[PDB]
């Protein structure tokens, strides 16, 4: 029997007794119990009988009598929560809301805790310990666990010690408090979206929530992260949602004061996450200004190398939520250079892409001797196929608004361009035709929707582009003949066939010098141009036949 | 303007262009005059007369300085984010196109200079350096005694005050290649960089370490850390000295506050300490920590711990004795597994301890734990191996990693539990598996005679793994008869039934014994299985065809009449390998039913208009070797044989 093997255990010299008794229980019911207890009677933390309190307190939670160590659990918890002294009540607090989990006294602990929580805002007004802060939090956490309407009382009390808290020992003890109200802050939130707030004012608490961003250091990581973990809890509830923007007028404000480098590799993701979410909820008031601020921040955090494949392709989906707002506005001139801005990022991607083609098929960092983070082991080329292909889809959507944008018949047809504008889509067209290198189906469906997002283009910069880019045209078929089919896409539309055409027969009646000495594949790459162009006359002759009958 | 650029670009125009050249200092007269000047207009200017010229800009570097400053002050100027778009892309254009022609102006000399001085001055621009051709540059100085020389200037002046933090944290982002890539190819690093790094770099940051304060340098503490790691990875310090200003300089970033870089601090002298009082080290880095830091100290702990003997496991086992933590202990009584011997006390409690635990990265850490545990008891001394071997059977019925867990219970077992698991679907499988390998190997005798309940009842796949492990334990006991009764039952089962399972089945038994139903040619189930597959030319029937039992059912004569049912059925239907090979194989025992010869031989005929090649090779060995239609049919094959393509047989 355990109460047999726990008597036999019993049976200067305390602190011994305590720590032989730990010993046993860690390598081994009611009675049980029921023995532990003449073991704790018979045997300021450094002090021996604090630490022999502290050990028997540790037995208690590892492993009637039960009911006499709940309650003066109940005592040490609601001591340390009311007094600085005698903190070391958090085992015993813990073991009482355990118990209290699984022993039908769950409402008289769940008042006590609700009375440490009440007692806690006092408790912290004297001291401006803790431990204490620690204690409320678990002490509201308790009460939370069961379904008793002290629910309600406890949620006061928590607001109430968060209104309040909104030497190098005070700066620890006053950390260690703002931790644990941001946690009790954030069981308020998450009890927020079941029903309405009987706060009195509902955006006291974001501020406060803002406030305490602003004070907590660098150096407590974890209580970022939970700070983080509220605001996300934020999003759920969308008065709070329409509330924030009036206050957050800065969105890089809680990256700015997390100069610690714990806060720099931590935040990045998931507060983007919130951010994310916060902004596909309130792109409608959001001012011009911060939706450049927004735009910009989330190029920026895009161009950035360092983050991962998810933080980038999350950026290109908010930046395509963002063309909606852009979009919605009116069509001036100055809005559209946000989209084209959007585009460059697109393009620069797309550039940092292919500059790693070659490693594929810098990223010399894999031997650094101290590594802050697990190293990836996710594919170069199938993580480039799929980047390449989702940003392909954002741009098929993004080259659609562009298209429903144009400046001043000019709305409706020949959208002008400047030659900036120019400029950057045969930079665009540059880089993509170059990752579609990266090597079916899936191939001629990305070709697809690079044809669908370049006829849409004026006439006039589109022929300007291929008249710049067809000798890239060529010098990229050499390689690849899958590349073929943009010409047949081209051609295909009844839009850019005219223009295409010409340019295509002008740039082979060029080149045709050449054709006979070369080898094999390559002309019969140039054999293949000259096929597509003479199909291009048949399939459409009211257009081509004009263009196509003096080269003949 | 800009048209103006394209003209001069052209080689037509080149009077206009020297004219241009004339007025060289003119031109960056009205600019010192923003919004009113444009400095693009000017830039372009500047790659037009570049292109045109390779000489021009060998002369260029006040240009290229005022060019600096002017796209500074107009960054500064179109850094207000208050109206919608006061950023115009002309200013980026000349941003990037400046970037190029000092790339092109640094491979005119190549003196590592003027890149720092443009680090330097890029304090203030938001615009990162151009992602292709800025980083092709770095490169290529990265890919001798001017390396050493370039490295010496490049740190006697990293110190400058006028540096800032992201850019210092770059000019160390392109230090660091060269160093590594020349580690790569090093010996010991000691070809005089290190020379001045001596007294320009610890003694100089006492005041910036002794900051105790967690902001944005972090990036040059960490990368202190990574470089004093990599230099003694190197090990050149034969003095001590620089040896003794490392030690405290390692000590004063334990006393940073930030705890990230205190844990790299950590990893530092535990580097320090593996190269060449660690108990006190060692002690502070077995307490908790949490992710970010728990990768920090278990990198340590695992550098630490083979350099740790010479310099001493009670104190674990202490800590101990007061999860994520509780797994990164097991990883850190794991990989001492080797040294356990060595503490002979601790190897029983640990393999308890690995055991309580043990009963996504859970699994894998069970999973590792299990194996840490048998391990530790194998190597202990049994008692030992039997409770090794009560747990993996233990853990292989909780849940290939199956296969993994039941070869470690059979090696535990090797040398009474196993029974109870090998005693009657992935659990299933695993427990089959357990048993097979078990009986292959105290425990291992008690689970070869119970696997015959897991081969009766593994509790498709469950079927295959326990119809496996008959066979495997069958085949372990021809080197008890239970085993053998169970996998001639499923070689019958599957035998009759003609997926996965039956071959699986008829494999099994094959390996157990030749007089099996599947196995044993004469054997009509196993011919009429043979039969089936050939009608549809079902893995049992497959299995069967591919055995031994069609090719050699014709010379056991009952099989008999399954063979003539199969040759019936494979002339009947479409000509397949297996079936053709069955048959070829069936034909060349009868010639050594008559008219299931004659229709094979007839299969093999229609299959011709490789296989009836060799089947036609088969018929040559015959003759040279050597009833009136097995005659005509037999001039039908040959007469068509001879109108074949191939020389060989026809000639």
Aim: glycine share 2%; with cysteine.
């Amino acid at each position: 029997v355990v109460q047999l093997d726990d008597f036999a255990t019993r049976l200067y010299q305390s602190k011994h007794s305590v720590l032989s008794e730990i010993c046993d229980s860690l390598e081994t019911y009611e009675y049980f119990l029921k023995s532990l207890i003449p073991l704790f009677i018979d045997v300021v933390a450094n002090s021996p009988e604090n630490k022999l309190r502290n050990i028997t307190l540790e037995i208690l939670h590892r492993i009637d009598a039960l009911q006499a160590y709940s309650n003066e659990i109940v005592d040490t918890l609601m001591d340390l929560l009311k007094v600085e002294n005698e903190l070391n009540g958090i085992l015993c607090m813990k073991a009482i809301t355990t118990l209290h989990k699984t022993q039908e006294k769950v409402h008289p602990f769940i008042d006590i805790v609700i009375e440490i929580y009440s007692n806690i805002p006092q408790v912290v007004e004297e001291q401006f310990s803790k431990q204490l802060a620690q204690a409320m939090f678990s002490f509201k956490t308790l009460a939370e666990s069961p379904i008793t309407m002290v629910s309600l009382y406890s949620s006061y009390k928590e607001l109430a010690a968060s209104s309040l808290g909104n030497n190098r020992a005070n700066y620890g003890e006053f950390i260690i408090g703002q931790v644990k109200a941001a946690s009790f802050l954030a069981y308020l939130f998450i009890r927020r979206q079941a029903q309405t707030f009987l706060e009195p004012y509902q955006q006291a608490i974001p501020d406060i929530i803002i406030r305490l961003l602003q004070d907590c250091p660098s150096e407590l990581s974890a209580a970022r992260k939970e700070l983080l973990h509220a605001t996300r809890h934020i999003l759920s509830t969308d008065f709070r949602k329409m509330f924030i923007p009036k206050i957050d007028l800065l969105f890089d404000l809680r990256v700015l004061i997390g100069e610690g480098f714990t806060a720099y590799e931590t935040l990045r993701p998931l507060a983007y996450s919130t951010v994310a979410d916060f902004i596909h909820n309130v792109r409608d008031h959001l001012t011009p200004a911060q939706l450049w601020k927004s735009v910009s921040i989330y190029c920026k955090n895009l161009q950035d190398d360092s983050l991962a494949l998810t933080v980038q392709i999350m950026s290109a989906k908010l930046l395509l939520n963002l063309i909606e707002k852009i979009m919605r506005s009116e069509s001036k001139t100055e809005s559209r250079q946000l989209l084209m801005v959007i585009i460059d990022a697109y393009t620069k991607r797309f550039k940092m892409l292919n500059s790693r083609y070659n490693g594929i098929m810098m990223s010399l960092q894999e031997y650094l001797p101290i590594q802050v983070s697990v190293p990836p082991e996710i594919d170069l080329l199938k993580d480039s196929r799929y980047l390449f292909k989702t940003l392909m889809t954002f741009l098929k959507t993004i080259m659609i608004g562009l298209k429903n944008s144009n400046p001043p018949n000019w709305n409706e047809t020949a959208r002008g361009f400047s030659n900036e504008d120019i400029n950057i889509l045969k930079s665009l067209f540059r880089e993509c035709i170059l990752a579609l290198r990266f090597f079916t189906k899936e191939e001629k469906d990305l070709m697809e929707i690079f044809a669908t997002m370049f006829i849409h283009i004026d006439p006039a910069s589109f022929n300007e582009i291929v008249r710049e880019e067809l000798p890239f045209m060529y010098k990229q078929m050499l390689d690849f003949a899958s590349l073929l089919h943009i010409p047949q896409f081209f051609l295909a539309s009844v839009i850019t066939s005219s223009s295409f055409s010409g340019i295509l027969i002008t740039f082979l009646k060029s080149k045709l010098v050449d054709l006979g000495e070369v080898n094999i594949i390559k002309s019969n790459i140039l054999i293949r141009l000259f096929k597509l162009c003479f199909m291009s006359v048949s399939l459409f002759p009211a257009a081509n036949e004009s263009v196509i009958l003096p080269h003949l | 303007t800009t048209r103006f650029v394209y003209f001069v670009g052209l080689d037509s125009c080149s009077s206009l262009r020297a004219k241009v050249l004339e007025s060289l200092p003119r031109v960056r007269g009205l600019l010192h005059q923003e919004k009113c000047v444009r400095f693009s207009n000017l830039v372009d200017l500047c790659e037009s007369l570049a292109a045109s010229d390779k000489e021009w800009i060998k002369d260029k570097e006040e240009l290229l300085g005022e060019l600096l400053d002017a796209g500074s002050v107009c960054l500064t100027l179109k850094r207000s984010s208050n109206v919608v778009s006061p950023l115009y892309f002309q200013v980026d254009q000349g941003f990037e196109t400046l970037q190029l022609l000092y790339i092109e102006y640094f491979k005119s000399q190549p003196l590592g200079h003027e890149k720092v001085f443009n680090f330097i001055d890029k304090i203030s621009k938001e615009g990162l350096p151009f992602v292709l051709e800025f980083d092709d540059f770095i490169f290529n100085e990265v890919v001798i005694p001017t390396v050493q020389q370039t490295l010496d200037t490049i740190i006697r002046m990293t110190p400058q005050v006028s540096s800032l933090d992201a850019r210092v944290y770059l000019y160390k982002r392109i230090f660091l290649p060269i160093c590594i890539y020349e580690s790569e190819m090093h010996g010991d690093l000691s070809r005089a960089w290190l020379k001045s790094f001596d007294s320009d770099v610890w003694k100089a940051t006492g005041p910036l370490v002794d900051d105790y304060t967690s902001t944005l340098e972090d990036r040059y503490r960490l990368e202190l850390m990574q470089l004093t790691a990599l230099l003694i990875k190197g090990a050149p310090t034969a003095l001590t000295d620089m040896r003794k200003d490392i030690i405290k300089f390692s000590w004063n970033y334990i006393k940073l506050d930030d705890n990230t870089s205190k844990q790299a601090a950590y990893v530092v002298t535990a580097y320090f300490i593996s190269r060449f009082l660690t108990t006190r080290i060692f002690v502070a880095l077995l307490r908790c920590h949490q992710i970010d830091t728990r990768y920090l100290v278990k990198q340590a702990l695992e550098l630490l711990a083979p350099v740790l003997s010479e310099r001493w496991l009670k104190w674990p086992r202490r800590v101990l004795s007061e999860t994520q933590v509780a797994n990164i202990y097991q990883l850190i009584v794991k990989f001492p597994d080797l040294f356990y011997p060595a503490r002979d006390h601790f190897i029983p409690n640990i393999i308890t301890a690995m055991g309580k635990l043990t009963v996504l990265e859970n699994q894998q850490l069970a999973i590792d734990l299990a194996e840490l545990i048998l391990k530790w008891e194998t190597k202990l001394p049994f008692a030992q191996r039997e409770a090794c071997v009560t747990f993996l059977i233990r853990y292989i019925c909780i849940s290939e990693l199956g296969k993994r867990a039941l070869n470690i219970l059979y090696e535990l077992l090797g040398p009474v539990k196993l029974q109870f698991f090998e005693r009657f679907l992935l659990g299933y499988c695993l427990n089959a598996l357990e048993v097979l390998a078990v009986a292959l190997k105290t425990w291992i005798i008690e689970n070869v005679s119970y696997l015959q309940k897991l081969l009766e009842k593994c509790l498709q796949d469950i079927q295959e793994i326990l119809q496996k492990v008959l066979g495997i334990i069958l085949e372990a006991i021809n080197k008890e008869d239970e085993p053998e009764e169970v996998t001639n039952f499923i070689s019958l089962i599957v035998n009759i039934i003609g997926v996965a399972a039956g071959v699986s089945l008829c494999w099994t038994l094959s390996l157990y014994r030749p007089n099996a139903l599947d196995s044993l040619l004469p054997s009509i189930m196993r011919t009429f299985n043979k039969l089936c597959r050939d009608h549809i030319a079902e893995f049992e029937a497959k299995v069967t065809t591919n055995l031994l039992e069609k090719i050699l059912n014709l010379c056991a004569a009952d099989q008999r009449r399954v063979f003539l049912s199969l040759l019936a059925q494979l002339i009947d239907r479409s000509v397949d390998k297996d079936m053709l090979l069955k048959v070829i194989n069936i034909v060349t025992e009868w010639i050594f039913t008559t008219k299931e010869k004659a229709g094979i031989l007839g299969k093999m005929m229609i299959f011709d208009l490789e296989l009836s090649k060799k089947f036609n090779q088969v018929i040559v060995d015959i003759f040279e070797s050597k009833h009136t239609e097995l005659t005509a049919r037999m001039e039908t094959a040959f007469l068509f044989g001879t109108r074949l393509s191939d020389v060989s047989i026809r000639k």
